């Protein structure tokens, strides 16, 4: 077997907007999980339904790495049974989630003087997302009682909202890059494990 491409995910030059979150399937390889835990670079390293220690002693049919950018304030929403704009409209974790949430401040890379407007999130939606759903829809949101007819305007809004990350913002309002590892065990032969 060969090593798993964690650098392809964690060290990616540009990250995705939370609404349009990226997923990477890791399979048929071996990967060490300890170094990351003692990376000295992760502001957040929560694990759910599994141990943050000796996790490397394990195995999985498939591992999924979901990357995106959100504020520091919203990192607390990348957990099961959470509520807020991100949990409800952007990225939803199931209650029975089995994996780790790793986040770190990327103010130096992702915020810009005058705003970095590449990072977006869904501000409006008719309903809450089901766990692991993804809405890349850019349909006009009808806030008023009268219909929009697909035309943006008064009481008719574009669903996505930009963050406009600036370095002078508070630590809570700064961009944070997030990688959500998901450990999948199916009733088929396993593919990823390595001590």
């Amino acid at each position, epitope marked *: 077997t060969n090593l798993c491409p964690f650098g392809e995910v964690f060290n990616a030059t540009r990250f995705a907007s939370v609404y349009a979150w990226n997923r990477k399937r890791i399979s048929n390889c071996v990967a060490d999980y300890s170094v990351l835990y003692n990376s000295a670079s992760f502001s957040t390293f929560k694990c759910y339904g599994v141990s943050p220690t000796k996790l490397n002693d394990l195995c999985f049919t498939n591992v999924y790495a979901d990357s995106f950018v959100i504020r520091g304030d919203e990192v607390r929403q990348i957990a099961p049974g959470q509520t807020g704009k991100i949990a409800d409209y952007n990225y939803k974790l199931p209650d029975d989630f089995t994996g780790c949430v790793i986040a770190w401040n990327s103010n130096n890379l992702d915020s810009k003087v005058g705003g970095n407007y590449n990072y977006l999130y869904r501000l409006f939606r008719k309903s809450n997302l089901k766990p692991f759903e993804r809405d890349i829809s850019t349909e006009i949101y009808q806030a008023g009682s*009268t*219909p929009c*007819n697909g*035309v*943006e*305007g*008064f009481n*008719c809004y574009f669903p996505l909202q930009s963050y406009g990350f600036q370095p002078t913002n508070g630590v809570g309002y700064q961009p944070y890059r997030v990688v959500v590892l998901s450990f999948e065990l199916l009733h088929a032969p396993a593919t990823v494990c390595g001590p």
Partner: antibody
Amino acid sequence: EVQLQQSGPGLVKPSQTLSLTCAISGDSVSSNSAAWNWIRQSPSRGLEWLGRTYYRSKWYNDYAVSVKSRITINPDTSKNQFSLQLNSVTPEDTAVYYCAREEQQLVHDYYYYGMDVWGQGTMVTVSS
Amino acid sequence: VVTQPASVSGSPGQSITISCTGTSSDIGAYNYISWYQQHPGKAPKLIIYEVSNRPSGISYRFSGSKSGNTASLTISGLQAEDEANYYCSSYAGSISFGGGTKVTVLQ
């Protein structure tokens, strides 16, 4: 250039019905972004809004309360016109009548311009 | 019902300001206020939309503002071509015009 060609001046005898036509050219009477209004003006009354007709999937009419019971605005997709009818006229209806397009901006930021384009006006005198 | 002064006069070069006052249900309800210019025997023309917006073609001599229940128009550098009637109008479902202001350029 959007232009509004109106229905030629004349006299309406009392108790009869006033009828005027506004013919649009350079725009569609069923525009997403438009409304088609009638406005009248008299030296003593000033500018008086009469009502609008607009198409957003369905056809719609708003009227002003001082004429609500006597008025009808009628779009004509066939001819690309809309019409005004005012029942039971009296000298009080002597006025210059205008058709105007109410225009909203549906691109980037929504703008509400108001009456951006006006017909030249037709003078109606109600007299016996 | 929306009040405008009947008559305003001015000399060339001066600056003028037409008051347009109404109710919380007419002018202060929204910021969909529009101003119109009318020369005699001609149709009105939009010169200001949304309180301060100048449609393309209108000089900067034309300014618009709002405070409270009074929208207001201002003409700087009063030229002789500015002699005309002026009306504010407000959207609130229905459309309300002010009574009008005849603007004289002294000669």
